[PDB]
Ligand binder design. Structure first.
Ligand SMILES: Nc1ncnc2c1ncn2[C@@H]1O[C@H](COP(=O)(O)OP(=O)(O)OP(=O)(O)O)[C@@H](O)[C@H]1O
Ligand SMILES: Nc1nc2c(c(=O)[nH]1)N=C(CNc1ccc(S(=O)(=O)Nc3nccs3)cc1)CN2
Ligand SMILES: Nc1nc2c(c(=O)[nH]1)N=C(CNc1ccc(S(=O)(=O)Nc3nccs3)cc1)CN2
Ligand SMILES: Nc1nc2c(c(=O)[nH]1)N=C(CO)CN2
Ligand SMILES: [Ca+2]
Ligand SMILES: [Ca+2]
Ligand SMILES: [Mg+2]
Ligand SMILES: [Mg+2]
Ligand SMILES: [Mg+2]
Lengths: 540, 543
């Protein structure tokens, strides 16, 4: 009706899905999608992990402004989103609702019609100023077209149960949904659009049949229960998992891999133990850029730069000299800054000197540091670490109700907040903070129970810490320097077998040597040749 | 007249069970039993592992030893230390082949079963009518010159009396015989006559034995009923089938393990532990990765003994000494002789292993009490006479058996294997079989795959990937500083390949820890120790 161009200010919960098939640019593709789902729709307030199941560089400088103000203001809750998960009282739908049974038979048909005839998933939740799914779909297919590669779909829209059959509308009607939401200053797009929306389906039809979706939704909205679906998202997912194992004898989680992004590239969760080189500037900036290189060639994937004589005077020129002498000359080290200072990180990010924030307070010193993790086109990854106190009070701040789980819950909550504020889940790393307000037997216990982080990207730092020495039994300070490095290599081995994603180390060459040998031992050609060869010997 | 004393010189196969409760003295007690077996009864041609075993009373639910050794009477039968490579009588025993009739009356199966089953319930009642301490069990096969089971039991009881519970020795089988003799009364001068047939006798030991031999069962009443018995026999004679038994030993042992899981949710394995012996004491198989510190001696003895002490303090449990212009003997013996003196100027003592294939060198070390273990890289194929030096009258010595092909010059060429992992394992098994046939206790034998010895780098890698193949065996490996380590790395030259090899070795130390390798042989004792300490701490979940 005319109710579509209703000017009354409204807010809706817009759960989406963002697809691609290109492996090499899935990050550069889907983050570009998000920036425009953030520009032209509302606010991203949830993301799932990324899963496996040059034109764009120029476009971003010339974009059509939105008729809505962009808000980098941090929030700590969302009332509308909280209403959505519970499915309480919200406004009546703009477009006509088919009932529970009417939707079910219409769902079965569109499946069977297409049944007769790697995928890179990432779901979102958008706090949206859009009025209705079809108004959103018009903006979506317009976004799709400006990206020239991508399939953005609507998965829910509040608790709405809408199926709309035949849809075609005029070349000015489409423009009169684009005028409502976007400044328009070119027309080739509308031509492809007109019949590229044939239908509307809320919820999406594939939702409970495709695995790539029930896996993304399990991350974001596990307890959510639509009137359409037979159970909660968790329970439909956990049935699909045991169903594939029982019926077809397939571990489905084996081919559908969780991804985390450090900088530019895909990274498969639990599939590598990256070395992170410690560069501690505490002074001659020549010697330090020399050391960065020494560490790259020794095998470090990441360099963790930290100066905590001003902090920015210790870190920024050292990073500046690095960036000059690098271009002096796909092997480029990822750079993380060990700072809690907003001004230092801002300067580093605005001069493109860093890729990761390593925040040892888990962004609780200055929550506003979260803002800086996203420019107009770039996102940045973050290490969130657990601690209590400072270096002077730490050692005494040691009582926990439940050590392992309090720290885990702490970090999960911290993530939840970053996520609510549109930091993409797959860019958040967990760090238990070994030796930071932990006794030695407590640091060990955290390692004992490291499996607790099997679903998450894990960054840890054991190197040279006092707890290593506590493990050892019985020139005085020189022997203990040797034992500390060697004791560290034990923890690298442990980390390797526990599939820890990143380890933060001083002794890069030694750790690389250890990881190389362990990797070789695991590099088995024929996975069932041990039993084959066993059987051959028994038949003499 | 007794045809039990008949002068007809016979060769019988006997299977014995040995038991003690003394944890600390288990090795000394059981090996003393082994000597007296070897001395008074025949030739030891098989042994099981040593086991720490849970007591099975209910089925269906100090210094004098050494002084005794100085004061033994001569056997009337000779000791022959010559190497054997086969034994016919034993092959006949295992097959159940044609053997002379029993001098003692045999019962049939149904009678045996009735009588054996009877004895069990009686004993079962007396025990429920009634005790914590573990048993230390071992089985042995003796090619015996004793005429019959009853005469054998008489001699066994003499052995048990000489030793002065401390020791129990049972006969499990004697040839293919089935025997159940109730109410045995042997006259005290019959006992004397039997003992005097086999031993040059030189007081109320004989009087004590009169009421000690109450009955005779062959097979032993508890053969099928005690886990600890079947556990030991599974090691020696897994496919043996006595007429009175439902199946082979392996099947019987296996059924028992499975029945314990189904009918009881017991893992019968967890509390019945396999033991190996490096020198003196019990080690539990797979419970500790021991460090073996390398000393290459190849005008140096003082600096070498210094290094010995550096290694002990750095945490080595074992020192492996090797000297392979100047002779091997001259390199190693002074160093060992000096170590022994310095140590005597002061159970914190390291075990001493000598890396040698030379009879002459080993003979001198053993004579002068300088070593505990033979590390033989040829797996005693170079001079099998060296096996004779592993047994004294009272001492047994442990031995590392290593796989190699050729010599250091032809070695890197002899590299073709049909089934690498299993060829090597079978080779080591056969070498163990020969030593075991020749009287070396199974629990003193250590397996070593010989990394880098006639293996291309990938082959040394494949061997480590497949180390699980030795989960049943005492395992010794030496990876330290070998070329195959560097073959793993993705990229001064003098002190950088050096660093990487040391650092790569520590990765294998880690892998070895998780694979529960029993002994690792390393150059870098302190570095290796720090790894193992840390990995041990992470594992200590204890409260
Ligand atoms: N094959 C056999 N081996 C040893 N003893 C036997 C055998 N058959 C019968 N016996 C009798 O059983 C008696 C058991 O005495 P002994 O103290 O040696 O063992 P036990 O502890 O009583 O029981 P077990 O024979 O179950 O170990 C022996 O003195 C002997 O007379
Ligand atoms: N993400 C991340 N970033 C880090 C980390 C870390 O673990 N994770 N650790 C340090 C180093 N901090 C540290 C150093 C020594 C000890 S300690 O074990 O030696 N104990 C001390 N207690 C008091 C003062 S130092 C503890 C922590 C610096 N930055
Ligand atoms: N039980 C036992 N005893 C041993 C062992 C062993 O593995 N097990 N190894 C050596 C040392 N021999 C050896 C050394 C090096 C290589 S190598 O292939 O790696 N070559 C080189 N090593 C260093 C420089 S070049 C091979 C064998 C001596 N004694
Ligand atoms: N495990 C084990 N248990 C026993 C043994 C023995 O040798 N081993 N001997 C017994 C009576 O001689 C009673 N119980
Ligand atoms: Ca927005
Ligand atoms: Ca003999
Ligand atoms: Mg679509
Ligand atoms: Mg017994
Ligand atoms: Mg007995």
């Amino acid at each position: 009706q005319e109710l579509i161009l209703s000017e009354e200010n409204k807010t809706n919960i817009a759960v989406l899905n963002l697809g691609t098939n290109d492996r090499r640019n899935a990050v550069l593709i889907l983050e570009t999608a998000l920036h425009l789902v953030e520009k032209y729709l509302g606010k991203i307030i949830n993301t799932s992990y990324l899963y496996e199941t040059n034109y764009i560089n120029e476009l971003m400088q010339n974009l059509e402004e939105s008729k809505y103000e962009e808000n980098k203001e941090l929030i700590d809750k969302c009332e509308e989103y909280e209403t959505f998960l519970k499915n309480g009282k919200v406004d009546n739908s703009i477009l006509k609702e088919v009932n529970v049974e009417n939707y079910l038979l219409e769902c079965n048909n569109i499946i069977v019609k297409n049944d007769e005839i790697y995928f890179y998933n990432l779901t979102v939740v958008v706090k949206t100023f859009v009025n209705d799914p079809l108004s959103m779909l018009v903006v979506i297919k317009y976004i799709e077209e400006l990206m020239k590669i991508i399939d953005i779909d609507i998965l829910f829209f509040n608790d709405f149960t809408i199926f709309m059959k035949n849809i075609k509308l005029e070349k000015n009607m489409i423009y009169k949904i684009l005028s409502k939401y976007i400044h328009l200053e070119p027309q080739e797009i509308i031509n492809n659009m007109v019949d590229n929306i044939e239908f509307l389906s809320i919820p999406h039809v594939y939702t409970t049949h495709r695995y790539s979706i029930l896996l993304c939704l399990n991350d974001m909205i596990p307890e959510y229960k639509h009137n359409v679906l037979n159970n909660t998202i968790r329970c439909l997912y956990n049935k699909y998992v045991s169903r594939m194992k029982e019926q077809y004898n397939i571990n489905i989680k084996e081919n559908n891999k969780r991804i985390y992004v450090l900088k530019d590239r895909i990274s498969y969760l639990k599939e590598k133990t990256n070395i992170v080189g410690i560069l501690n500037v505490n002074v001659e900036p020549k010697r330090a850029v020399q050391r960065m290189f020494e560490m790259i060639n020794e095998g470090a994937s990441v360099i963790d730069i930290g100066g905590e004589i001003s902090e920015r005077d210790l870190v920024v020129p050292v990073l500046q000299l690095f960036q000059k002498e690098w271009n002096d000359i796909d092997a480029k080290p990822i750079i993380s800054i060990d700072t809690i200072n907003y001004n230092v990180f801002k300067e580093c990010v605005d001069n493109d000197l860093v890729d990761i924030l390593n925040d040892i307070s888990a962004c609780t010193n200055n929550p506003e540091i979260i803002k800086l993790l996203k420019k107009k086109n770039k996102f940045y990854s973050v290490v969130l670490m657990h601690k209590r106190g400072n270096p002077h009070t730490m050692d005494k701040l040691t009582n926990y109700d439940n050590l392992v789980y309090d720290i885990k819950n702490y970090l999960e909550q911290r993530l939840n907040f970053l996520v609510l504020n549109g930091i993409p889940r797959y860019r958040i790393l967990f760090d238990i903070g070994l030796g930071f307000a932990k006794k030695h037997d407590q640091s060990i216990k955290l390692l004992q129970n490291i499996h607790v982080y099997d679903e998450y990207p894990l960054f840890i730092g054991y190197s040279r810490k006092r707890f290593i020495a506590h493990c050892m039994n019985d020139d005085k300070d020189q022997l203990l320097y040797q034992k500390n490095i060697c004791g560290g290599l034990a923890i690298a081995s442990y980390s390797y077998y526990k599939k820890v994603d990143l380890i933060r180390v001083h002794d890069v060459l030694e750790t690389k040597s250890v990881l190389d040998v362990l990797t070789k031992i695991d590099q088995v050609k024929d996975p069932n040749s041990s039993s084959v060869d066993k059987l051959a010997a028994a038949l003499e």
